[PDB]
Design a protein around this nucleic acid. Structure first.
Ligand SMILES: Cc1cn([C@H]2C[C@H](O)[C@@H](COP(=O)(O)OP(=O)(O)OP(=O)(O)O)O2)c(=O)[nH]c1=O
Ligand SMILES: [Ca+2]
Ligand SMILES: [Ca+2]
Ligand SMILES: [Ca+2]
Ligand SMILES: [Ca+2]
Ligand SMILES: [Ca+2]
Ligand SMILES: [Ca+2]
Length: 903
DNA sequence: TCATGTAAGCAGTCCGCG
DNA sequence: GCGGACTGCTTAC
């Protein structure tokens, strides 16, 4: 088998590499790497090396990496460019693996762990680590085993061994419901004292050294806690045994409320699952506790225990250990669904970077582009410093706020990367400039053609049409992978709807789910078999279809994110290929493309409908247009339709057969106008939206830019079993809106769009009447809490203190002297509740850590003093007033002359 | 919230306002 | 008690 790296580090003049050899064995080697850099030389001098602009360079081969670094400093002082890859471990990986890496994940040791630490005096700070580690569960992907280290004797209590038999039992029978499928995989190890637990854990770590180290919050808690605890007991040299190269870097973030550390373990790639999740999931959660995220992702219940966690080990050691094990497993279950570790490995090896560098699109692209250029014997430019400079982005149309009955939307495929490819935008493809007209003149095709020789953007830039740019070339590769995976995702999505339709008429039989690949549209024969399946089998199939969809979603959306990352990297000062001419060539072209096609669509629909000057395009943002389809429906006549699906079919065909070809002709003209290298402006139909036929539903509405709601019947070719709300920007979409209010507002919207005003009024009246009965957490607002210190003047609010920060200060004063009260953490999210006048907290609101119950000592007072009137007004009524005034509807029946009668 | 980019909405503070 | 200038936060793309 072909070899592949696991980890790489630079330590002085040495590269330390862990890798898999040709026999599939894990090996480590220290290499005195001899790096090369480059300097421009005279044209007369023969060389195989050229910079990206075709200028000759000489290779400087250095005896060591320090020599190479010192040369860079001297060149800077002389004032000459020092070219080539200055991150030597990237150069090393490129030299060592000069081929497309095929990796075997079964050889890569992926470790997932979490620790428990009983603390009778508040949160156990990793930087201090003054309390015993009393449990560790460490799952090893190669052994497929959960290694459980259990401390039986501690200054905070001596306890009996944990029971696997009791652990497996149902919670309703006094057990802990440790899942049956991992019971056989647990290796339990009790210890009579902390020192032997920790020594054994280190010995174990040596035998089974993680390559990828993950878990929930491991970077900020478990790793620095373990490191500092070992350091305190045994000394730092023993702590450094956590690094296969015995090298660590400790970085301390000082703060007004307490300092914390992050530990770099040389020779390990730490991918904290919370960071993976935040980067790759495309959610914004109100809380990032594992309980909340597990509930969100897996629909499993909160891990219930009585009393504080500081007393759980002593009162119920049995459950304490089971919960530690289950928490480790939950992360594994989320990853089985989401597949972020797989993605990280895919991306890391593709780029030839340290796996942890997947978090940085700038590092990722620098490596991809370096490897690409190196193949052609080309030499990369030196990284330069630039001042931060704002620059223009996309265009967003101002919509007329209103209800909109029938809407069809259209969207450009992968816009920014497509612009890069179409225009041929790269550092080395720049051909010159042309004198710009106002953008409006290009949009309306009155400006003179920019060039009949080069490929142009309306920002004034011209590019070579005949040479391949490294940026377009490498962006195309990832785009094509993105396209493949999005195909698999949409197929699984369509397949899911086939199963949902078949669930309306399940069969009374004992059968099994069909063995099929959900990444491909079901054949006619499979669809026939599905129509005869039982509910049990259909439900299992739907689960499998949805899991396939989620895997496709992970794969496509993050490759989309990577290529989009390159377009913005051009406008980031730390990017080697930073250049506002290119960043701006992209965004400006986008602005033109959107407004050009709005004109073309308005022109086309007026023509086919036999009118002039009517505005069909009602809205657009960046690369999308929203087309009012009312006149289309009216041209044929509503009564001509049998049911909802008939008019949806009609509009789907109208868009594909009439509109899309006109859209294509429009963009082909624009491509000729700009003399671009390749036509890649592909704008396909996205949503078909409207009210159910024969209903009083309004179909959709806009309140403003980035704020709208649509009742969607078909999305990108997925014909839904049941209509689906597409809501953008409104409070239902914001993580700061209370959970129960999101729900109530969404149903208000559903009623407006599908049923009409009277239905809305009925629901509003009910919610208003019942809302005081909702659980306090469900009606609490949420906010991130940044710069808490700045506004903290002797426990009271300073000037311009934000509302949520005021709530934290109110909380801090309320929990003073209470050692068991959870502290609010800087930068994390809080629940927020307004308080009534005269409350014992002495202020207008309170805030506490999100995803938790407020501490029992002040909970009673919070419930008593909650200002429901204010909560309803601010979070529910005011947003709803926004939706309904825009929609020209009322949520309350208003007074009229009819009130004089007894109805 | 350690990690490409800009556009742009709403909540809230402070200030003005016979 | 509402509007403008300002920060903070969050979402759409
Ligand atoms: C969603 C998103 C878009 N953008 C930019 C780049 C996109 O090309 C542009 C349009 O956004 P989108 O239309 O959402 O995405 P896309 O055109 O790149 O991909 P597709 O429509 O095929 O799914 O806005 C970002 O920079 N960051 C983002 O998170
Ligand atoms: Ca725990
Ligand atoms: Ca798009
Ligand atoms: Ca059936
Ligand atoms: Ca879009
Ligand atoms: Ca599309
Ligand atoms: Ca109390």
């Amino acid at each position: 088998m072909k070899e592949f790296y696991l980890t790489v580090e630079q330590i002085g003049d040495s590269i330390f590499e862990r890798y898999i050899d040709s026999n599939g064995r894990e090996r480590t080697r220290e290499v005195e790497y001899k790096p090369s850099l480059f300097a421009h030389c005279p044209e007369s001098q023969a060389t195989k090396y050229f910079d990206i602009y075709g200028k000759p360079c000489t290779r400087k081969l250095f005896a060591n990496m320090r020599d190479a670094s010192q040369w860079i400093k001297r060149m800077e002082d002389i004032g000459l460019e020092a070219l080539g890859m200055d991150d030597f471990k990237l150069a090393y990986l490129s030299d060592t693996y000069n081929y497309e890496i095929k990796y075997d994940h079964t050889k890569i040791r992926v470790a997932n762990f979490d620790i428990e630490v009983t603390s009778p005096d508040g949160f156990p700070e990793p930087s201090q680590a003054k309390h015993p580690i009393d449990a560790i569960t460490h799952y090893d992907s190669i052994d497929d085993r959960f290694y459980v280290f259990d401390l039986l004797n501690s200054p905070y209590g001596n306890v009996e061994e944990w029971s696997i038999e009791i652990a497996a039992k149902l919670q309703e029978q006094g057990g802990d419901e440790v899942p049956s499928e991992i019971i056989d995989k647990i290796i339990y190890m009790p210890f009579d004292n902390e020192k032997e637990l920790l020594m054994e854990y280190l010995n174990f770590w040596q035998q089974k050294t993680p390559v990828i180290l993950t878990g929930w919050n491991v970077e900020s808690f478990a790793i620095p806690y373990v490191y500092n605890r070992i350091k305190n007991i045994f000394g730092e040299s023993t702590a450094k045994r956590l690094s296969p190269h015995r090298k660590t870097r400790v970085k301390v973030i000082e703060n007004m409320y307490g300092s914390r550390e992050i530990i770099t373990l040389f020779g390990i790639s730490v991918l904290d699952y919370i960071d993976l999740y935040k980067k790759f999931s495309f959610t914004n959660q109100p809380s990032y506790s594992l309980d909340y995220i597990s509930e969100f992702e897996l629909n499993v219940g909160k891990l219930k225990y009585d009393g504080p966690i500081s007393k759980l080990r002593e009162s119920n050691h049995q459950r304490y250990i089971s919960y530690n094990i289950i928490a480790v497993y939950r992360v594994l279950q989320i990853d089985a669904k989401r597949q972020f570790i797989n993605l990280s490995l895919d991306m890391g090896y593709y780029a030839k970077i340290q796996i942890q560098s997947v978090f940085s699109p700038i590092k990722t692209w620098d490596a991809i582009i370096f490897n690409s250029l190196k193949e052609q014997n080309k030499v990369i430019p030196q990284g330069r410093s630039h001042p931060v400079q704002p620059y223009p982005g996309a265009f967003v149309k101002e919509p007329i706020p209103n209800r909109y009955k029938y809407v069809m939307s259209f969207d450009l495929t992968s816009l920014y990367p497509s612009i890069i490819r179409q225009v041929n935008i790269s550092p080395e493809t720049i051909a010159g400039t042309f004198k710009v007209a106002p953008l409006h003149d290009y949009i309306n095709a009155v400006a003179e053609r920019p060039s009949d020789v080069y490929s142009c953007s309306p920002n004034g830039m011209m590019y070579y049409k005949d040479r391949d740019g490294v940026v377009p070339t490498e962006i195309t590769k990832v785009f094509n992978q993105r396209k493949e995976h999005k195909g698999y995702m949409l197929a699984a999505q369509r397949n899911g709807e086939i199963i949902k339709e078949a669930l309306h008429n399940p069969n009374l039989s004992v059968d099994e789910p069909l063995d099929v690949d959900y990444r491909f549209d079901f054949s006619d024969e499979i669809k026939e078999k599905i129509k005869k399946l039982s509910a049990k089998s259909l439900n299992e199939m739907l689960f499998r279809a949805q899991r396939t969809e989620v895997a496709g979603m992970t794969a496509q959306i993050n490759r989309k994110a990577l290529i989009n990352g390159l377009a913005g990297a051009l406008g980031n000062v730390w990017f080697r290929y930073y250049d506002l001419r290119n960043a701006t060539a992209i965004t400006t072209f986008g602005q033109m493309a959107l407004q050009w096609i709005e004109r073309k669509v308005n022109e086309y629909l007026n023509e086919v409908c036999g009118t002039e000057g009517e505005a069909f395009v009602l809205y657009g943002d960046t690369d999308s247009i929203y087309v009012s389809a009312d006149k289309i429906i009216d041209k044929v006549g509503e009564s001509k339709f049998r049911d909802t699906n008939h008019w949806v079919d009609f509009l789907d065909k109208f868009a594909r057969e009439r509109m899309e070809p006109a859209i294509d002709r429009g963009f082909r003209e624009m491509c000729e106008y700009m003399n671009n290298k390749q036509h890649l402006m592909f704008m396909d139909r996205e949503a078909i939206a409207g009210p159910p036929l024969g209903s009083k539903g309004i179909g959709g509405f806009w309140t403003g830019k980035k704020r709208y709601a649509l009742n969607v019947w078909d999305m990108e070719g997925t014909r839904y079993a049941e209509p689906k709300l597409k809501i953008m920007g409104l409070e239902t979409q914001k993580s700061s809106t209370p959970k129960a209010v999101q729900k109530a507002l969404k149903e208000c919207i559903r009623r407006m769009l599908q049923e009409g005003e009277e239905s809305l009024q009925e629901y509003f009246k009910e919610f208003e009447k019942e809302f005081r009965q909702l659980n306090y957490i469900s009606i609490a607002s949420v906010s991130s809490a940044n710069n808490i210190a700045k506004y903290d003047v002797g426990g009271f609010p300073g000037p311009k203190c934000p509302f949520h920060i005021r709530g934290i200060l109110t909380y801090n004063r309320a929990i003073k002297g209470n050692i068991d009260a959870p502290q609010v953490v800087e930068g994390e999210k809080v629940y927020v509740l307004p308080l009534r006048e005269g409350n014992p907290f002495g202020d207008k609101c309170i805030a506490w850590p999100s995803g938790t119950e407020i501490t029992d000592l002040i909970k009673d007072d919070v419930l008593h003093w909650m200002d429901y009137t204010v909560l309803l007004e601010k979070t529910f009524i005011k947003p709803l007033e926004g939706f309904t005034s825009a929609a020209k509807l009322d949520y309350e029946k208003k007074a009229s002359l009819f009130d004089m009668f007894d109805f």
